[PDB]
């Protein structure tokens, strides 16, 4: 956020002013069943990317491969 052009006074996420805070997940089963941390490995490239390989199969036949 600093590199993106936003200078930061203070530190942390315990916002003293008029902002919403997000405390850490309470380490008790009640909250551990409703919530779970974001797994970065689940953010993926859309598989539509693989449909671009259709161009390759057509060019290969056009060139007689």
């Amino acid at each position: 956020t600093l590199r993106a052009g936003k200078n930061i006074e203070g530190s942390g996420q315990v916002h003293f002013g008029y902002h919403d805070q997000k405390w850490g997940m309470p380490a008790i089963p009640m909250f551990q069943l409703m919530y779970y941390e974001l797994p970065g490995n689940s953010i993926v490239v859309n598989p539509c990317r693989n449909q671009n390989y259709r161009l390759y199969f057509e060019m290969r036949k056009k060139l007689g491969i």
Binding site: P39, I43, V44, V45, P47
Partner: protein
Amino acid sequence: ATRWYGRQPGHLLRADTYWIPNLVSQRFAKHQPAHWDGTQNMPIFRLADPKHKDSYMVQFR
């Protein structure tokens, strides 16, 4: 411009064994073919946004 580009939601897999409701419900789900419509943004999964109806259980911090 940077904030705007960042709200364009990313793609998040529906597969989830961490939430016990999905751990059970997805065992009975039927995977149907998603026929390509000519785009690169088909939301065939859930979206990586806290306000999505299938991602609200995830903690974005």
